[PDB]
Amino acid sequence: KLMSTSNTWCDLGINYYRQAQHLAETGSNMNDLKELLEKSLHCLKKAVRLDSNNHLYWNALGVVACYSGIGNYALAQHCFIKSIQSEQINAVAWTNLGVLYLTNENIEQAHEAFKMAQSLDPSYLMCWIGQA
Amino acid sequence: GGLRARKLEELIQGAQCVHSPRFPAQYLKLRERMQIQKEMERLRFLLSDQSLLLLPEYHQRVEVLRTLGYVDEAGTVKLAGRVACAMSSHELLLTELMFD
Amino acid sequence: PDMTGQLVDLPEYYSWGEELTETQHMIQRRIMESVNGLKSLSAGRVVVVKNQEHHNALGVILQVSSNSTSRVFTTLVLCDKPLSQDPQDRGPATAEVPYP
């Protein structure tokens, strides 16, 4: 409220994401948390448009966009690609594409994405687990 | 060389410039411009990268690296490259032994 | 300049003029570089002499020094009989174009 910057916007969006995740994960409800997820997307999109040259905001938008409640995979792929273009040294975005392809029965191309991610950072955990 | 000289002599003995009113001035000016342009070309080469004595050997080394699996096309290090990077000695042989 | 018409071949002629001399100089080397030139070069040999002093004046070599490393030719060369004694009358003139 008293200092409007992009980082706080992105963090607020992630927090709303966590709240929705906790509500769903206890099976307490479904489809009654829609407003929470739309609020999270609104905050994350505001952060990205405020400064659209940061791999972090695009990556956060991609992760939230593919949550089970939203299920918008095209936007997720677009966001991961934009994050990679913004900063080439990015293991997180490559591994996120690998997960997205792997869950949609695309073993070969996911294998390629994981290989790129570990080539850029040999001690990142998620890429090694994906390879396993 | 002698045959090219003979052909140039044959062509030169029929030149149209020899009969032009303005043969000396334009011709000398062309001499000057070509000489200056040539010296500029050599000068630009001296400041370039092809002057470097060891540049072809660098290219050959990059090819040897890329034939093994250490460097992607257009030179980005792969995992084997980063393994042989942080190694004390016999980097190529040791990393090849490890992968095999 | 404007070369449309009687001056169309003005640049190309220049090239034809230059390369021949370059070739001629190379050919001239292929004359002294040969062992056979080194055998022919002796007394009783007439040569055409080209320098600032003699411009293709005919001269006859009297002898070639035994030291074939610094080959200095004591040579009789024709020039105009000097009707002057003062170097102050000599001045830069038009650069003699190589004509056909």
Crossing angle (nearest 10°) for helices A107-120 and A91-103: 170
Burial category of B27 from C-beta neighbours within 10 Å (exposed 0-12, middle 13-18, buried 19 and up): buried
By what method was this entry solved?
A: cryo-EM
The DSSP code for B17 is G
CA–CA dist A61, A70 (Å, integer) = 12
Residue among C13, C28, C96 with most chain B CBs within 10 A, to mutate: C13
Number of other CB atoms surrounding residue C14 within 10 Å: 19
- Residues with Cβ < 8 Å from A19, sequence gap 6 or more? A36
CA–CA dist B77, A121 (Å, integer) = 11
- A90 residue type, one letter: N
Q: Which residue(s) pair with C46 in the sheet?
A: C60
Number of other CB atoms surrounding residue A68 within 10 Å: 8
CA–CA dist B6, C71 (Å, integer) = 30
- Three-state DSSP class for residue B77: strand
Contacts 24+ apart (CB under 8 A), C33-40: C38/C68
How many CA atoms lie within 13 Å of C3's alpha carbon, on the beta-carbon side? 16
- B34 residue type, one letter: M
Chain B's closest residue to C24, CA to CA, is B5
- B41 residue type, one letter: E
- B64 residue type, one letter: V
Q: Which residue(s) pair with B43 in the sheet?
A: none
Task: Give first-to-last CA distance, chain B, whole Å.
Answer: 58
Q: Are residues A122 and B79, on separate chains, in Cβ contact within 8 Å?
A: yes
Q: Which residue(s) pair with C74 in the sheet?
A: C63
CA–CA dist A55, A125 (Å, integer) = 20
**Do residues B24 and C13 make contact, with C-beta atoms less than 8 angstroms apart?**
no
Residue of B80, B76, B75 lying closest to B100 (CA atoms): B80
Residue of C6, C20, C92 lying closest to B26 (CA atoms): C6
How many CA atoms lie within 13 Å of C96's alpha carbon, on the beta-carbon side? 4
Burial category of A121 from C-beta neighbours within 10 Å (exposed 0-12, middle 13-18, buried 19 and up): middle
The DSSP code for A90 is -
Number of other CB atoms surrounding residue B76 within 10 Å: 12
Phi, psi of B35 (to 5 degrees): -60, -45
How many CA atoms lie within 13 Å of C92's alpha carbon, on the beta-carbon side? 1
CA–CA dist B39, A37 (Å, integer) = 69
- A56 residue type, one letter: L
How many CA atoms lie within 13 Å of A18's alpha carbon, on the beta-carbon side? 6
**Do residues B28 and C10 make contact, with C-beta atoms less than 8 angstroms apart?**
no
Number of other CB atoms surrounding residue A69 within 10 Å: 18
Q: Beta-strand (E) ranges in chain B?
A: none
**Given resolution (angstroms):** 3.1
**Do residues C14 and B16 make contact, with C-beta atoms less than 8 angstroms apart?**
no
The DSSP annotation for chain C comes to ---SSTTTTHHHHHHHHHHHHHHHHHHHHHHHSSHHHHHH-STTEEEEEESSS-EEEEEEEEEE-S-SSS--EEEEE---------GGG-----------
Which residues of chain A have a CB within 8 Å of the CB of B76? 119
Q: Are residues B77 and A119, on separate chains, in Cβ contact within 8 Å?
A: yes
- C65 residue type, one letter: S
CA–CA dist C35, A38 (Å, integer) = 94
- B48 residue type, one letter: S
Shortest distance, CA C47 to any CA of chain B (angstroms) = 20
Q: Which tokens hold the place of A85?
A: 């273009």
- Order of strands across the sheet that contains C45-50: C45-50, C55-64, C73-77
CA–CA dist B10, C100 (Å, integer) = 9
Inter-CA distances, B84 with A70, A112, A114, B98, C61, Å: 44, 21, 20, 10, 71
Shortest distance, CA B42 to any CA of chain C (angstroms) = 18
The DSSP code for B71 is B
CA–CA dist C30, A65 (Å, integer) = 79
- Three-state DSSP class for residue A113: helix
